């Protein structure tokens, strides 16, 4: 069929692959056999680009940007894309892997009885059909309702609270919590019974005054279940969202996890047992989609990310430009507006539009570099510096002369393989690559000239190394210190051009992807005898 692009997780085994349908084809590392076939529910090209500093996998469709982190080994990718709801009565769509889902079900028909909720046979319908259809590809198998928020919503209340009175515990407690969870996030229109989740607990310690301490900081209690209520200025009171213990007046070398089993070992999430908690890992494997404009109205024309492991960036069409601080919760950090008739701008150019194409930030005082084509009429690609800690150009670097004329724009911007360096690809609206030095003129200039030679991919291996895939189908493996190519593989058979690659961290083959749809691994005397 064709996938038109790849991406890899270095901490999973999997390869994410885009399709030309709209879908991700998760396949196994080792072998090569489809592990998975899921639609993101999104709505252009589709990214599935998994960002390594950052360490989460980001999928990114014409609109929206969705940030969902690994869990259990396995991506939650039916719903990556799907954006929060606006009505109760919206119909919300939910994925449960296969085995939550079991227990979801074996509680619905052995222990207890929620039956009769409004919707509950199409939540019943719906979750018994997922289960009987998925009956590696087990492992990574997942079960979606298609149901109104409220029905959901209220379905999964129904069996916390009739698991919580039945007080028996059993593996679909944590599942509806966290349904319950991920529910009320899709819909974004201290209290105790809201401390189930850790997200909240965490939130909780916004006024932690211990946050020098190296163990009893705010997320590593939020883990153990403690969330933080205090009760005069600077109290450290942390208490436990199910056990009831209270605990204060902590010390650098407490831990968590010690602090809560000697206080109260009787405590059903110190055991381990199922409690209502809703971990972190599901809610950052299952957080909703978010738009980067406030409205959600434009196209998604970047969605560049960093070196920072706490920031990712994404521009509009109509120039608002967000940055997430995709660190935990995805929080927008910022959003500011680009306007062509900008200081720098105006006099660099010695009617006007500025476009964004490219996006990244350096780290080792941070700093947005976006990649745009103005089109005053003349076009002319640049540089941009923005502010990240905000909405000020810092600087705007104005490429060689002779992109003026050449009528070319920026596709790419990576920060060097082994840093201190900047590596960013120009092509044509037959391409420039050009070398920048990070600021704390270029130092390294080089022209693509024929045809079937322009890059479609970079991978900059660690000046580090590169990997590119041409328009002609041969990859050009190749050493950024002098550009030297380290090996063209040719496609396979008529030829399929190559139109991308990615490597396999846990493999140690790199895997390149055709345009026909076709994988392919490419690799990259005696004491005895002496006197004792």
Known sequence: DGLHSLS????LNAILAVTSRGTIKVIDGTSGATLQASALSA??????????????????????????????????????????????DDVVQL???????????????????????????LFITQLKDGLKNTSKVAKWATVTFHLPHHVLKSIASAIVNELKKINQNVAALPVASSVMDRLSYLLPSVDRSLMYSEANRR??????????????????????????????????????????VCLVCWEPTDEPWSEHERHSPNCPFVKGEHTQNVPLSVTLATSPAQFPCTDGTDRISCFGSGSCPHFLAAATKRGKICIWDVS??????????????????????????????????LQQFPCLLAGGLLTYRRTLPVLLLYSIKPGTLVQCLRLPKFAEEENLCIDSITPCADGIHLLVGLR????????????????????????????????????GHLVITTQGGYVKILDLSNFEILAKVEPPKEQDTFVSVIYCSGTDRLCACTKGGELHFLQIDLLVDQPF
């Open 8 to 11: 890899y997780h270095p901490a």
């Open 43 to 88: 709505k252009g090209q589709v990214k599935c680009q998994y960002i390594s500093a950052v360490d989460k996998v980001i999928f990114v469709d014409d609109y929206a940007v969705g940030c969902r982190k690994d869990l259990n080994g396995i991506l939650l990718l039916d719903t990556a894309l799907q954006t929060p709801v606006s009505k109760q």
């Open 95 to 121: 994925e449960l892997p296969v085995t939550e889902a079991q227990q979801l079900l074996s509680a619905c028909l052995e222990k207890v009885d929620i039956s009769s909720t409004e919707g509950y046979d």
């Open 203 to 244: 939130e909780t310690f916004t006024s932690w005054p211990h946050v020098g301490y190296r163990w009893a900081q705010p997320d590593p209690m939020a883990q153990a279940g403690f969330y933080h209520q205090p009760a005069s200025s600077g109290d450290d009171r942390a208490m436990c969202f199910t056990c009831s």
């Open 328 to 361: 935990k919760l995805m929080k927008v950090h910022l959003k500011f507006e680009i306007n062509a008739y900008d200081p720098a701008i105006v006099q660099q150019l010695i009617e006007v539009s500025l476009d964004i194409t490219a996006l990244s930030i």
């Open 428 to 463: 044509t609206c037959g391409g420039y690559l050009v070398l920048y030095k990070m600021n704390y003129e270029p130092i390294k200039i080089q022209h693509i000239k024929d045809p079937q030679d322009t890059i479609t991919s970079l991978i900059l291996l660690p000046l």
